[PDB]
Amino acid sequence: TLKLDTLSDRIKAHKNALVHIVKPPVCTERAQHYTEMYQQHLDKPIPVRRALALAHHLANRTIWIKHDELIIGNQASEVRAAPIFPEYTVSWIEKEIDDLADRPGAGFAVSAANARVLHEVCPWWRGQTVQDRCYGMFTDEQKGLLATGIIKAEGNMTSGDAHLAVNFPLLLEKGLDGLREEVAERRSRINLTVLEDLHGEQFLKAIDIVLVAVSEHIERFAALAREMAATETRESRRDELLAMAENCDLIAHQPPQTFWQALQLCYFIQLILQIESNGHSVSFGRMDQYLYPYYRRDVELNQTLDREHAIEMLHSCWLKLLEVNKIRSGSHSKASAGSPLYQNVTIGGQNLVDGQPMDAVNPLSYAILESCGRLRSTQPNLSVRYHAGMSNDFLDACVQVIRCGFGMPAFNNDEIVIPEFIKLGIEPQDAYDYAAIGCIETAVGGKWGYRCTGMSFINFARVMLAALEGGHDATSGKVFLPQEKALSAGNFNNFDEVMDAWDTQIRYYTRKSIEIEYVVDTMLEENVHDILCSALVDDCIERAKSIKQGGAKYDWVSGLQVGIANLGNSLAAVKKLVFEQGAIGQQQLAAALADDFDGLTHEQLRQRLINGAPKYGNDDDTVDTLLARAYQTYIDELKQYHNPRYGRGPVGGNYYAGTSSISANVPFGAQTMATPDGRKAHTPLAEGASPASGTDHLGPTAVIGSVGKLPTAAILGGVLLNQKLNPATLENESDKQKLMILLRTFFEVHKGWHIQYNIVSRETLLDAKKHPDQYRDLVVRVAGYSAFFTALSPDAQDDIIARTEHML
Amino acid sequence: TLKLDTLSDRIKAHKNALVHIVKPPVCTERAQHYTEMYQQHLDKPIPVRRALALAHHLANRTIWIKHDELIIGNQASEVRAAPIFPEYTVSWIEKEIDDLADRPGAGFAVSAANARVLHEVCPWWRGQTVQDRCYGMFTDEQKGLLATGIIKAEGNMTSGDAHLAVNFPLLLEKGLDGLREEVAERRSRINLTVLEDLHGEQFLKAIDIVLVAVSEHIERFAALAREMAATETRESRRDELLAMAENCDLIAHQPPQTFWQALQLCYFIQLILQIESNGHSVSFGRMDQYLYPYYRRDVELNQTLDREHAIEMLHSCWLKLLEVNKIRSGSHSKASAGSPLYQNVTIGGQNLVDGQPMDAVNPLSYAILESCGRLRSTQPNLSVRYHAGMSNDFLDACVQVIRCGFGMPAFNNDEIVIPEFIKLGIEPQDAYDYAAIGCIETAVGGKWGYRCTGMSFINFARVMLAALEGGHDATSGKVFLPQEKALSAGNFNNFDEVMDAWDTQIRYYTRKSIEIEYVVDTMLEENVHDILCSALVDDCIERAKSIKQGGAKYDWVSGLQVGIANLGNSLAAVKKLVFEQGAIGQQQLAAALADDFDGLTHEQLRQRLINGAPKYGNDDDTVDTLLARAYQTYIDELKQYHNPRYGRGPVGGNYYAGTSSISANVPFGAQTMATPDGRKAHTPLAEGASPASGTDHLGPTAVIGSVGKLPTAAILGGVLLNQKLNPATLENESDKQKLMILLRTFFEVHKGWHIQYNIVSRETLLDAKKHPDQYRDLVVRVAGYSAFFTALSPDAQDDIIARTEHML
């Protein structure tokens, strides 16, 4: 039984201050400092240059302590300001600098002074950004493809990688000084007449520079806590500032001793990771595991910390996570509705103890789950690892928080992840220690490279349209892979030849997508080393190189395949109504597609495509297994490739499939013409691996049956299942045991990847669209993450409103 | 019987024009163009950027045809102008820009316009040069060492590498178009989802850009030959311009057909190598071998070319080689007296034909040797490969040209090079095909990396002084390796402990010298790829990477060890007069050294050190073998290291020893305090492996006996033996057979590396110092190369005058 409605006035005030910043500012301090240090340290090796950049910026940037917070450390000069990261790109910044205030769902306030700084700073970076260096190396074919949008790698060319959890256990065990000794021991083995050691030494030096800077930065906050306390009238707050300054002094160097110390050190690293890099889905991993030793002592064993005060510490941290901000281009913002950072916290699961699995749920799991239920913030992205031996008590507490209406927790599934991770070659103890990263993707926190998911996007719908029409992409007018068969030519002899054309086209776009990733990953590898992040991932220090160079113990990545339901639904309709029945002719379908189903005749055809052929999500094998078979081609193609770190250190070095495409369904649909499932041109595609909205008519159990027929084991980037309920459907205990049995059957029987529940009423979302000043704290689940509804663009809002409402 | 006194009026006029340019100009066209293209192509990979730089510069630079030359292609805008190469360094340029006209022996004329260009161009390069990037990576210890001058790598930090011969046979066999097809075939095997191929493709693309640019550049000269012919009044010259334009059009694409075509293509590559890079000792290799097929057809078989006209073609080429110029810093110019480019031409030797050696001397060998005797220019640096089966006829022709007084030919020795190259693992056919490079060093032309010699300089004398005195370097006052024993402390128990201190100190400076080379080589590797040069060396195209990245079939390098005679002479004196005799005390010697032998007492001590202990070069085993034993420590130390290309492609990847230090003996001596061989502080050290001047009193046969006792097989960078004769000593046929027998005994019996003869009178060099406008064509041999005496600084002049005059 959880108390999920109580918040301290400290937390309420802080939380309310954050939710009411609706046009957050842009901070340019980091952009200035990195430009200054790049210019003065042009002679240094890039990782050393980048280390000196971070050191300079930390020592000279604006720091502060606000809202009487118990966890300190600001990302930028102003509250919720987005720093600027010019080394990735300045292209969209120079184009959009005057027009940032009014981008729908992605508006930022650029002060006139900050506008002037950016106009001095940005021209220097031209030619030197990751994105420019990508275009300096792309072939013309690769450039053409990217220009269409059929393949996209915008999130990789304009941002740091992130999409991982660092080794928080190592950090807590050694402290910063013990990492320094680790680095020193490793440099003691450098032989400067060995080429690899010459390079390793430069990277190890950079790590040491950064560790020193982090130690000094924590001390800088300790000194700030003291100076503020000397002018703090309220006694109680002043004792807090003192204890924090005391705590900072310790964690600046030594392994933390108290739970409050351990959390602050973890947050410090979490924050500085997102100062040295704007990569998102920086994730905490299994915090209920590696923070439990401190919780057990402070809260249970020595009872020197009140469990209510511990929850108050967590709340302070969560609000700091909401403070983290990130600005994106106009285009990429549409694919990330709600300005998300995707900072994941994993709880639950199991532990491999002496070769025997054991439930990992503990009181900290409960206290974390409860702290999130009380706070109902979009950060952290709370993920529960389900397993068969997870208790009804804990699973009930989870549903109690699902009831609170902010979309959390979501569920990953040990019953699929651990067996498949072990199959890949991950050491079983490590596989049992996996975390959620960002949204639904999974990795072994602290031992894995970047991007378990987040590599290039392929628009499956547009590739399919091209396969039905001579390789012609109607959006761009290009034919990247010519083929003779086309509906407009009526020269398809049977549906098998349509599948051939799908197979042939998707084999082409997959190869080109890997070629493009090779360019981007390599430009990132050479230009934007993450020093702190590498330092905190096995085994970068020992190997003396960055994560992107092969430093991580494990390296597997996935891209995102967009338009899943649309691919299956479209093939199933042309298979049935064109080929199995002759009810619709090839030239007739093609004319309706080129026309966007215009006119009452084509509109009747369209409605026949919509309702006279089966749709993914109704437990109909004829469409579900056709979708799996279409996807299987892409999955098989992936097997012939290796990722760029292959053979350079990590286990694996391979690709697998992924469907966590966030809100890319909306802009990807915008550039997708009409499709044979009856979808109108420019309208959203389906999101994730969810059924197309309004096509799933046989209830949620039919949905999870369809989803289970995908090749989940090959889609280790994650199969995203959204689901929407009206609050009344979850009001009763028998409604609760209903949902619980549905979860366990999904995970234990269907081996499903993931589920998340939206509990919201169609009236609430309509009213909030009308009066946003009222629901500034209303949180809605989008695709893998939750967001503030009033902070979404109307386009993104209506996509949520258009989603199926299901009944248990 | 050679006609060595005849020159055409064409050649005389051209030669006289060149010798009378005494303050050559600086050209800034290349510096502008490389700056422009680096700036516009910041987004391209460095080899692609550098390829586009060369393409831009070739297409836009000033070209011309002058002096009615038969071989065309200018290096810079003005005759004998030195281009400027900012990517290596702009440090000495910014310091010395206003003071270049009056550097003794290294004066250049910088027009006011060119001064303005350099002042705009150079600041951009700060932080981005090879030299700046070296100092961005050196440890403090490495920086301190370099600041003393005890180790020097100035020629590597401020210049391209060169020091090789490209694969002229491959060039002649395929032509430019066939190289293009080779590149295309190789790119056809690039897989852009394989990391190594991604990088290989960038390098292959750069090569193709450059090949295209060279083809277009040859066509640009063809068009210039035509435009000039249309305004050429003299019929005969106009037919020449036409034939050349015709020849250029062919060699711009196809394998050359005529000897005149083959020579011009070879020169075109020789010239453009020294436009893309200012590295010197760019060498032609065995031109008498790979040009013979064309000579045999045009001159002997079809008699369509007069052998006198062929010699006239060679002469035109040689004068183009003299046109090539290069400016150096004030400091490094003192180590390279006479503005030398060291463009070597190897003739003679043998050929491994079906496993059987065969004399390689042919009519082209004779015609080349004769053309150099007639011209008496400092370029090319003509080198004969002696072998036991070399004829008396050819060896007589060689001595006939030695008689002409310009220092050439010098001799390398197959009897030592081939056995030792094969011992290294060089394929026997390749070992038999070796060439001279630059001065005395040797390599397999077309298949070898850069720097057979030319890596870091170590001052052996200063290391020895530090070994006699606590590790203290008296010039700098530093103690890089402290030791307890010091003459000033009189705490040496015996001479064996002095050798221990030598061994210990030189082991330290050798390691540091390799550490420094690792930094410099790596900064060169990453920043200044040579595209054309790599393209023309096995196996860079196949491996798809630069020479500096491991592209070459063979890779061995050597540094330069300076003060050879001084090391042996100094140890032998302290061994005998301090330790074996007690005639001189430890504190007494140290006080005289710290005093620079000042006062009549210390001057008497000094004369006892000079003449009362044996000197290297008198065939005295007690000093000669002590020198060999001292050097042997350095040679053994080298065995524990690998050069940076080791394991990255080439056979070998190792170091050996080298003594071709050019004129570094003079500035190295300037920074060497007094030494126990009686040498005064700041005075020259001995050059190469030559006896200290005036210490060799028992004639030339005693000199070659001393030299032969060095470990020649371990000094594959070359053992430099200068020797000076008065012209009268070579006047008679019995004086000739004398010298010939001395050569064969040196090479066949003593296995000597090299010999070169100066035939000049002490009166001539004195008169020329007084009246230089008279002897502008007087050539003197310095150390491995010949130079114009009137173009030397007084310091360098007197070092030549101070050399021993020997009698046969």
UniProtKB/Swiss-Prot annotation, chains A, B:
Residue list for modification Glycine radical: 784
* Residue stretches making up the Glycine radical domain: 687-808
Q: Which Gene3D superfamilies match?
A: 3.20.70.20
Q: Which CDD domains match?
A: PFL2_DhaB_BssA
Q: Where is this region: Disordered?
A: 675-697
> What keywords were assigned to this record?
Lyase, Organic radical
InterPro entries in the record, alphabetically? Form_AcTrfase_GR_CS, Gly_radical, GRE, PFL2/GDeHydtase_fam, PFL_dom
Q: Where is the PFL domain?
A: 9-680
Query: Superkingdom of the source?
Result: Bacteria
Other facts: Contains a dehydratase motif that is predictive of enzyme function.
State what this protein does: Probably shows dehydratase activity.
**Family matches, as PANTHER family:** DEHYDRATASE YBIW-RELATED, FORMATE ACETYLTRANSFERASE 3-RELATED
NCBIfam families listed in its UniProt record: PFL2-3
Q: Which family, according to UniProt?
A: Belongs to the glycyl radical enzyme (GRE) family.
> What protein does this entry describe?
Probable dehydratase YbiW
Name of the gene this protein is made from: ybiW
